[PDB]
């Protein structure tokens, strides 16, 4: 199967170091005279690219914002098939979804494969993992609250992803406090409630988190 | 060099509209433009590529042309779905070469059949409130346009604090999803008999109640 996807930290604090690491497979016929970028792209606004690196040549480049040209550095692994990107002196005003993108050669270029994206938070608060809360229930609803956690972000499944219709997970509120909280909840025949088990699974990969919650009938249900 | 792109762009389902993308010489001039559709909060998708090329699996209804130094994305036909931002690029030759990104355009298709919120009210969990806290937790999806405001009530009276809100997001079936939550201690919620999430969308409004319950 065709892939191209980052990893690394989600957290890293102002003035250190950033590494990412984009991993790839699955189309290793169509590699000759490849490139793959980094883009990024803050909350709520632009795509911004920040570097360009040559599969098969040995040529690279950076974009010339004076804010970043000094602090950004692109390379390859071609045993692995990655591209690792490492940003210095990161600041709060750094903190975005990363994306690596890959310029295949056919002077026609263009980003035709992404990534999923990895989101990064420049901050110098610590990680919290969450605390998760169940919300009990022709349909009901049920769900679970996952409190109090940073960095972003967090994801959730139910019944270890086979269950999948009727989900929704919402997108996290951010408190004053400067930690999020976020709910997801499944939409289910009520008759089921009493031959099917619900158990969200939460997954906080920041704080290497992981939770699973049985949500059960209401207590004191009067 | 920058590329410059409209802010914003609408039309009404099955009209036909553009978005324009100005550059320079050394970018658009010289080079091949592509355009990415983006649904905020997911990675973009290559659209158009080599000024006039659709990629594979993209809807015949997308076209891109370029003449001088501006580049047009065209959509012959508007659907629900074209909600999105979408970005032109192009390489640039000029200092020691880079890419450069135009700053997106927020497409709105107006005149869309309304859809109304479908709203889910829950109580503080006992474990919540075994922990010293109570969190009311509405949930609000399945809407279009995206904007809804929350009013919350304990018994009749407007809560004056301890409300946080999301903004909208869109959903991936195109409709817009967020949450309100209210936060209590548990004394303040046990001090009235039920409280209230109501959801105005586009002049409607609409109402879910929950009420403490005490076991002893």
């Known amino acids: 199967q065709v892939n191209l996807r980052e990893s690394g930290p989600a957290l890293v604090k102002p003035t250190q170091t950033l590494t990412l690491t984009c991993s790839f497979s699955?189309?290793?016929?169509?590699?000759?005279?490849?490139?793959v970028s980094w883009i990024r792209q803050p909350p709520g606004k632009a795509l911004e690219w920040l570097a360009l690196?040559?599969?098969?040549?040995?040529?690279?480049?950076?974009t010339y914002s004076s804010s970043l040209k000094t602090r950004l550095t692109i390379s390859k692994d071609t045993s692995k098939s990655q591209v690792v990107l490492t940003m210095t002196n990161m600041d709060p005003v750094d903190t975005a979804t990363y994306y690596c993108?890959?310029?295949?050669?056919?002077?026609?270029?263009?980003?035709?494969?992404w990534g999923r994206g990895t989101l990064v938070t420049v901050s110098s608060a610590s990680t919290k993992g969450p605390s998760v809360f169940p919300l009990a229930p022709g349909t009901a609803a049920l769900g679970c609250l996952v409190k109090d956690y940073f960095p972003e972000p967090v994801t959730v499944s139910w019944n270890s992803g086979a269950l999948t219709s009727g989900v929704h997970t919402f997108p996290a509120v951010l408190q004053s406090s400067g930690l999020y909280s976020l709910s997801s909840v499944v939409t289910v025949p009520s008759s089921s409630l009493g031959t099917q088990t619900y158990i969200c699974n939460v997954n906080h990969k920041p704080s290497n988190t992981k939770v699973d919650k049985r949500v059960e009938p209401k207590s004191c249900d009067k | 060099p920058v590329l410059t792109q409209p802010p914003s762009a609408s039309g009404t389902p099955g009209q036909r509209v553009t978005i324009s993308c100005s550059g320079s010489?050394?970018?658009?001039?010289?080079?091949?433009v592509s355009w990415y559709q983006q649904v905020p909060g997911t990675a973009p998708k290559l659209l158009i590529y080599?000024?006039?090329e659709r990629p594979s699996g993209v809807p015949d209804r997308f076209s891109g042309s370029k003449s001088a130094t501006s580049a047009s994305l065209a959509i012959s036909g508007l659907q629900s779905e074209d909600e999105a931002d979408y970005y032109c690029?192009?390489?640039?030759?000029?200092?020691?070469?880079?890419?450069?990104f135009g700053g997106g355009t927020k497409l709105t298709v107006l005149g869309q059949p309304k859809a109304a919120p479908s709203v889910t009210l829950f109580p503080p969990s006992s474990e919540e409130l075994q922990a010293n806290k109570a969190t009311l937790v509405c949930l609000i999806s399945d809407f279009y346009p995206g904007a809804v405001t929350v009013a919350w009530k304990a018994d009749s009276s407007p809560v004056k604090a301890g409300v946080e809100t999301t903004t909208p997001s869109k959903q991936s079936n195109n409709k817009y999803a967020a949450s309100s939550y209210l936060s209590l201690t548990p004394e303040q919620w046990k001090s009235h008999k039920s409280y209230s999430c109501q959801v105005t969308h586009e002049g409607s409004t609409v109402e879910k109640t929950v009420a403490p319950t005490e076991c002893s």
């Open positions: 080599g000024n006039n």
């Open positions: 993108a890959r310029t295949l050669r056919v002077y026609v270029r263009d980003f035709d494969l």
């Open positions: 699955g189309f290793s016929l169509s590699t000759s005279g490849m490139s």
């Open positions: 690196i040559d599969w098969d040549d040995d040529t690279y480049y950076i």
């Open positions: 690029a192009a390489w640039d030759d000029s200092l020691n070469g880079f890419w450069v």
């Open positions: 010489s050394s970018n658009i001039g010289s080079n091949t």
